[PDB]
Each structure stands twice: as structure tokens, then as C-alpha cells.
Amino acid sequence: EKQILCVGLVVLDVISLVDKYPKEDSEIRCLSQRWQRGGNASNSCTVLSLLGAPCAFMGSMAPGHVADFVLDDLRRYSVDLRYTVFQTTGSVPIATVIINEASGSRTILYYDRSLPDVSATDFEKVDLTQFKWIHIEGRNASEQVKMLQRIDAHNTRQPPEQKIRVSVEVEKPREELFQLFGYGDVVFVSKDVAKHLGFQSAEEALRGLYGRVRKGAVLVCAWAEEGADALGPDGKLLHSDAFPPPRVVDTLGAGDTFNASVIFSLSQGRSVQEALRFGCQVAGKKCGLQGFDGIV
Amino acid sequence: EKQILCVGLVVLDVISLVDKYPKEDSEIRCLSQRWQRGGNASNSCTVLSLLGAPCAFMGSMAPGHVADFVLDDLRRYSVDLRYTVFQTTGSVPIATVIINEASGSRTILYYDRSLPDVSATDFEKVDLTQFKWIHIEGRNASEQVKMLQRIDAHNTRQPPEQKIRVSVEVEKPREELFQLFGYGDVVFVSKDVAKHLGFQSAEEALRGLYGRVRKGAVLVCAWAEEGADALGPDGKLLHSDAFPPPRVVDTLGAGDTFNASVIFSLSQGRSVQEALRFGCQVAGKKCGLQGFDGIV
Ligand SMILES: Nc1ncnc2c1ncn2[C@@H]1O[C@H](COP(=O)(O)OP(=O)(O)NP(=O)(O)O)[C@@H](O)[C@H]1O
Ligand SMILES: Nc1ncnc2c1ncn2[C@@H]1O[C@H](COP(=O)(O)OP(=O)(O)NP(=O)(O)O)[C@@H](O)[C@H]1O
Ligand SMILES: OC[C@H]1O[C@](O)(CO)[C@@H](O)[C@@H]1O
Ligand SMILES: OC[C@H]1O[C@](O)(CO)[C@@H](O)[C@@H]1O
């Protein structure tokens, strides 16, 4: 089977579990603290690997002990690391994550460490014939548009059944990312992006943004407890309710779990309605568990 | 001049500066992140060194790069490290500190790493003749009571002007620490401890706890924006208003700055009223500055 490639950034999540959300200006004893490999596209590889899809991760890396921790972790999941881009400057970014044990909330303090991003030129080296699906985590959009253009160009020269399917995620409310709406077969837009653009529900977001996707695309917007919606070319609004666990313990990476699961379901040939439901079910199962392993 | 000894624990503060206090379940970009040597008694040594008092720090240490960072930092301040207790298990504890750039608040998530504490037996090795003042950060009280007993025993055999002056801090609302109230010439009790015991002001706390200190002792309770109070044997309540800076930027270690400053003022022979005022002034100056260096 051909692999699913994810392009994005691995992050070191340094996770502090507390029994309540820290009141400002207090001192609180943490229940525990752990390191966990993170990053959106990186977490999606974890879930795709767990679901049984061969996959490859492409991101920048800076050698060192943090590098070794996260790369060792990806290897444990049998994620193909062929296209790691080693950088000679900067370092693996760090996210300081507070998990409220009472609600499973996650609050993320993020700190850029100036690691250079994967470039269009880096991407030119990928052997596209190896992949049946390529997922791109939106970050340095002007370069990513070039990567997406290279995939399109490849696709024109292939039969309908050998075309690489493409998804993109637009998760941060940053202007430069919106151009990515117009690329890919599947476009994931976050609730945060939606709300930043003045939309109040997944349905408003989809109706209000659909005109920006490429002809034939499916636009997907997950909305936490309210489930997830999608809108395709036929104009039909699709929805799944959320499937919460009996007790929500850890929502760090729930959206990434949703994304990977939708990608997997669609790549298996399932309908958008089915993918939305599967996505919500796996994400909801993940929320009732620490980390990712117990989803299967 | 004889030194001032502080017994306590060095902590690595990993500090994230943000422009607002993180809303639960959000993602926020940090303005910056830095390492800073911390720990109560450890921060007090920093300030005493800056004020021009020769001092020594005694705490547990676990070799490694964190150790090297904090020990190198203490050496920069010319703090005597003769009595470092090297441990072969556990590691230097880590405090994850969120500083709200808008208010200077500090919110501390603390994570024990099972480093063994300094013991009464460790303390027996100290050459008491070297010190004119010994400050003890309240932690493992049953052992610390033994250290305090050894200092008392030493003192009985010395002239009034060669007696070592002693202070203790009771900062955490933990039962085992309250026994320490009955030791030392100067007893610092925190606002947090006071409020945990049902007191609503520094004055209520002092009137309500004075019966627990040893005959002749001065009990001190700092109350942030409301200044600091003290109560000695003569029954007179003493007070200084706070001296806030024009802009409060960083209150991490303000209490430790207050403690060190009161200790310094008293060790120089100043009155309790003067020490309280000096303590409030140096602390307030420290609050308008990142870290400690600019206080002098
Ligand atoms: N609290 C919850 N209860 C039940 N299901 C949830 C909950 N939160 C999220 N989900 C499911 O996860 C899907 C994706 O959640 P999303 O709103 O994308 O969270 P996220 O902030 O992107 N997670 P993270 O990857 O850490 O950023 C939602 O559509 C739900 O189906
Ligand atoms: N916001 C403030 N404005 C002005 N002065 C302050 C302020 N906060 C503290 N101070 C001064 O610092 C003294 C000690 O503050 P305290 O209430 O002990 O804070 P703290 O929580 O122990 N600091 P830290 O060492 O990080 O735990 C107070 O008595 C004041 O004199
Ligand atoms: O992108 C930074 C952060 O977002 C996440 O990927 C969650 O989706 C975290 O794992 C990572 O630390
Ligand atoms: O004791 C743990 C924490 O308390 C402080 O000493 C402040 O008084 C911090 O510097 C340290 O990280």
C-alpha cells in the first residue's frame, strides 16, 4: 500500500497535569509532568499509524536529545522518516501544556525556537509516486502553496485512480494561511479560525467559506462538543454529533485525532458522512484516555 | 565579616512570559521563556549578596546540567557553596512559572523530583563559628527542628554578642511546618499560611500566632499590596505600607527579596520598624524589574 504523507512540525509537549486550572498568582502542586511528542501533523501520523495506515512524516529537525526523544517516538510508530529535514540552526519548539485533570482541558503556551520551516525546495525532493494522500499542516503558506502546486502538476499527468489526494489544515487565525483554502480535496478549518472570522457555528463557517475552496473540494469544520460538519460540491451540509467519553481526561491532540481519522476513513473510500462520524468517534474515545495509544 | 547562612532548596524556574493570563483551554504565544535560578532561601542569598552581605547557601544538589546552571549562577553572586549536599538520587526540582506581563503576577506550577532534603546529620557538619545569622526555609521540619536545636545549644555557650541570630520561614500551609514557629529570633509567616489558618490581615495573623513564638521573638507577616507587619515581645504592632514601583513587571521572588532585606537590615543592627520599611522598599523596587540584579 502507498503511504500517507504528513508535512508539518514536530513539537515537544511538556505536560503538567493539575487537579484544577491554576488560579492566577497562585502556587499549585502538579499531579505529574511528562514529555509527549506533539505537533499537529505529527500527532495525526501517530493516529494514522495506530489505525493501520502506513505513513511518512516530513518536518524540520534539529539534532540533540529532544530530537532523539521525538524521532525515537515516531520510529516506535513505524512512521517513515526518510524526508526529515535536518537544520543546522534553531531547535525543536517546546509547548508547555497544562492539563486540568477535572475537565481534560488543555491550555498551551507555545514558544517558537526559530527552527527553519520545510521549504518548497525541500519538498521538490519527495518522490510523489510513493504516496496516495498528502496532508499539509498550514504554516509557511507561500512555500506550501508551491508544494501544493507541485502535487497538482503531478496529478494532471496521472489517471483518475492514481491521483494523489490532498488535504490541508488551517488551524491558526493567521492571514497568510487563508490562501491555502483554495488547495486540496479536503480542507480542515478550525473553530478558532471560524470564530476569528466572525462565525458562530460550524455551519455558518462552512456556508461562509465554501466559496474559497477549489472546485470539488470538501470543507470540514470540527466544533468540539457540538460535533463536526462538512460541506461538499453538492451543497449538502453534513454533520456528526460528538461522541464524548464517560469522563473526559485529556483533550490534547483531539483535533489531530479527528483530522487523521477523517483522512483515514476517506482514504479507505468511505463517504464524507461516515468519515465525519468515524472522526468524531475516535476523537471522543481519545478524549477519555491519556495520550493516543488506547484508541485501538 | 561572618557570613549569613541560608538553608533551603535551589529550584530551576522555567519562566514563560505572556501578555495576558492564559484563558483555560486556549493556546497563547509566549513573549519569551527563560531559565532562572529560584527557590526561597536561594533567592534570599541572591538578594543578600546584592545588598553586600557575605553569605553561604546550604541545599541538596544532583549533578547534571541543571545543577551546573544553578551552581554557576550562585558562584556569580559569590555565594559560598561549601555546604552543598550532593545527592546520588533524585534531581533539582523544576517550577514552571507563568508571568503575566500585564500585571507582573506569577503563577507557579511546582513538580517535586524526589531529591532528598538536607538532614540534621548533614547540618551537624556546619562550622557554626563561621556565621552571624542562620536562615532556615521551612521544609522537612522534624529534621530542621534538630538543626535549630544544635544552633541553640551552640548559643548557650557563647557571649550575648557572639550568639548566632536565627530566622525561619513558614511559607507553605503544611501542618508539619507549624512547629517551626517556636524557634528563631525572627519568624516569617506567609500570607498564604495566615489565610489558610483563617486570618484576614497581617495584624490578625500576628495577634493570633504570637503565642507560638519563643520568648523574645519577632513575628513578621508580609501581605503583598498591603505592606508588611511585625510583632515583638513589647506587644507593639509595627507596620510598613508597600512601596510599589510605577509599573509592576515581575513579582517572582518578591517575598524572598522582602525576607532577605529584613534579615540584612536587622543584622546591621536596625530597628524592626526600619527593617520592615527597608524590606518593603527593596521588594517593591524588585517588582518593577525582571529578576533581581537592578535592585542595586
Ligand atoms: N470535549 C469533547 N467531548 C467530546 N468530543 C470532543 C470534545 N472535544 C473535542 N471533541 C471531538 O474532537 C473533534 C475535534 O476537536 P477540536 O475542536 O478540533 O479540538 P482541538 O483544540 O483542535 N484539539 P488539539 O489537537 O489539542 O488542538 C470535535 O469535533 C469532537 O468530535
Ligand atoms: N504587587 C506589589 N506591589 C508592591 N509591593 C509588593 C507587591 N507584591 C509584593 N510586594 C512587596 O513584597 C513583600 C512580600 O510579598 P509577598 O506577599 O511575600 O509575595 P510572595 O508570593 O511570597 N513572592 P514569591 O517569593 O515569588 O513567593 C510585600 O510585603 C510587599 O512589601
Ligand atoms: O502546534 C503546537 C501544538 O498543537 C498540538 O499539535 C495540538 O494540536 C500540540 O500537540 C502541539 O504542541
Ligand atoms: O519553592 C518553589 C518556588 O518559590 C520561589 O522560591 C518564590 O519564592 C520560586 O523561586 C521557586 O521556584
Cβ pair B28:A110 closer than 8 A: yes
* Amino acid type, B144: Q
Distance CA B165, CA A68 (A): 51
What whole-number distance in Å separates Cα of residue A221 and Cα of residue A190? Answer: 6
Kindly list the residues from chain A whose CB atom is less than 8 angstroms away from the CB atom of residue B256.
none
Q: How far is CA A99 from CA A33, A119, A278, B25, in A?
A: 10, 33, 25, 9
Provide, as residue numbers in chain A, all residues whose Cβ is less than 8 Å from the Cβ of B26.
107-108
Cα B244 to middle of ligand 2, angstroms: 9
| Residue B92: closest CA among B76, B74, B105 | B74
Could you tell me which of A222, A256, A280, A227 has the C-alpha nearest to residue A95?
A256
Q: How many Cβ atoms from other residues are within 10 Å of residue B171's Cβ?
A: 21
Which ligand has an atom closest to residue A249 CA?
A: 1
Residue A245: partners with Cβ closer than 8 Å, 6 or more residues away: A284, A285, A287, A288, A289
CA distance B107 to B104: 10
Asked if the Cβ–Cβ distance from B107 to A24 is below 8 Å, we say yes
Cβ neighbours of residue A79 closer than 8 Å, sequence gap 6 or more:
A45, A46, A49, A55, A56, A57
**A188: β partners:** A169, A220
Q: Which of A197, A201, A210 is nearest to A239 (CA)?
A: A201
Q: Is A253 annotated as a binding residue?
A: yes
**Closest Cα of chain A to B17: distance in Å?**
10
Question: Residue B154 corresponds to which cell in the numbers above?
Answer: 551552640
CA B69, CA B47: separation in Å to the nearest integer?
Answer: 18
| SS3 per-residue string spanning chain A | CCEEEEECCCEEEEEEEECCCCCCCCEEECCEEEEEEECHHHHHHHHHHHHCCCEEEECEECCCHHHHHHHHHHHHCCCECCCCEECCCCCCCEEEEEEECCCCCEEEEEECCCCCCCCHHHHHCCCHHHEEEEEEECCCHHHHHHHHHHHHHHHHCCCCCCCCEEEEEECCCCHHHHHHHHCCCEEEECHHHHHHCCCCCHHHHHHHHHHHCCCCCEEEEECHHHCEEEECCCCCEEEECCCCCCCCCCCCCHHHHHHHHHHHHHHCCCCHHHHHHHHHHHHHHHHCCCCCHHHC
Phi/psi of residue A80, nearest 5 degrees: -65, 125
Ligand 1 touching residue A248 (CB < 6 A): yes
> Closest residue (by CA) to atom 11 of ligand 4?
B39
Rounded to whole angstroms, the Cα distance separating B284 from B286 reads 5
Which residue owns the Cα nearest ligand 1 atom 31?
A: A280
With beta carbons less than 8 A apart as the criterion, state whether A161 and A141 touch: no
Q: Are B147 and B7 in contact (CB under 8 A)?
A: yes
Domains in chain B, number: 1
Q: Is A294 one of the annotated binding-site residues?
A: no
Tell me the torsion sign for CA atoms B199, B204, B206, B210. Answer: negative
Largest Cα–Cα separation, chain B: 62
On whether the CB atoms of residues B165 and B151 are closer than 8 A, the answer is no
Neighbours of B44 (CB within 10 A): 30
User: DSSP of B82-98, one letter per residue?
Assistant: TT-EE-SSS---EEEEE
And the C-alpha cell for B262? 529584613
- Which value, in Å, is the radius of gyration of the alpha carbons in chain B? 18
Among left, alpha and beta (phi > 0; psi -120 to 50; other), residue A135 is beta
Burial letters A126-151, b for 16+ CB under 10 A, else e = beeeebbbbbbbbbbbebbbebbeeb
- How many residues does this entry show for chain A? 296
Give the whole-angstrom CA distance, residue A99 versus residue B147. 39
Closest to B181 in 3D by CA, of B170, B172, B197: B170
Is A287 a pocket residue for ligand 1 (Cβ < 6 Å)? Answer: yes
Q: How many CB pairs under 8 A join A and B?
A: 77
* Parallel, antiparallel or unpaired: strands B94-100 and B106-111: antiparallel
Q: If we measure between CA atoms, which residue out of B150, B48, B197, B93 comes closest to residue A33?
A: B93
Q: For residue B68, with 0-12 CB atoms within 10 Å meaning exposed, 13-18 middle and 19 or more buried, which class applies?
A: exposed
User: Read out DSSP for chain B?
Assistant: --EEEEES--EEEEEEEESSPPPTT-EEE-SEEEEEEE-HHHHHHHHHHHHT--EEEE-EE--SHHHHHHHHHHHHTT-B-TT-EE-SSS---EEEEEEETTT--EEEEEE---PPPP-HHHHHTS-GGGEEEEEEE-SSHHHHHHHHHHHHHHHHTS-TTTSPEEEEEE-S--GGGGGGGGSSSEEEE-HHHHHHTT--SHHHHHHHHGGGSPTT-EEEEE-GGG-EEEE-TT--EEEE-----SS----TTHHHHHHHHHHHHHHTT--HHHHHHHHHHHHHHHHTSSSSGGG-
Question: Residue A142 belongs to what domain range?
Answer: 1-296
CA A38 to centroid of ligand 3, rounded, Å = 5
* Amino acid (one-letter) located at B125: K
Match 508551491 to its residue by C-alpha cell.
Answer: A146
Distances (CA, A) of A133 to A42, A136, A217, A231: 15, 10, 14, 20
Phi and psi at residue A14, in whole multiples of 5°?
A: -100, 110
Residue A139 phi/psi, 5-degree rounding, is -150, -80
Using CA atoms, how far apart are residues A75 and B166, in angstroms rounded to an integer?
A: 57
In sequence order, the β-bridge partners of residue B111 are: B94
Going from the C-alpha of B38 to that of each of A15, A196, B62, B83, the distances in angstroms are 21, 39, 15, 18
Contact A97, A15 (CB under 8 A): yes
Which residues in chain A are contacts of B111 at CB distance < 8 A?
16, 29-30, 32-33
Which ligand gives the minimal distance to the CA of A42? 3
Q: Report the interhelical angle of A272-287 vs A40-51 (nearest 10°).
A: 100
**Structural contact between residues B164 and B157, judged by C-beta atoms closer than 8 angstroms:** no
**Which backbone phi and psi does A7 adopt, to 5 degrees?**
-110, 130
Q: Residue A223 has which C-alpha cell? A: 466544533
Count the Cβ atoms, other than its own, within 10 Å of residue A296: 11
Strand order in the sheet with B106-111: A27-29, B106-111, B94-100, B11-18, B32-38
Tell me the CATH number at A136.
3.40.1190.20
- How is residue A289 written as a grid cell? 484516555
Q: How far apart are the first and last CA of chain B?
A: 21
CB A261 within 8 A of CB A274: no
Residues with C-beta less than 6 Å from any ligand 4 atom: B 11, 13, 38-40, 43, 95, 108, 110, 253, 255-256
Technique used by the depositors: X-ray
Q: Which residue has the cell 493501520?
A: A52
Q: In this structure, what are the phi and psi dihedrals at residue A57, rounded to the nearest 5 degrees? A: -110, 135
- Residues B249 and B103 sit within 8 Å (Cβ to Cβ): no
Q: B29: which 3 cell numbers?
A: 504565544
d(CA A69, CA A35): 9
Count, residues in chain B: 296
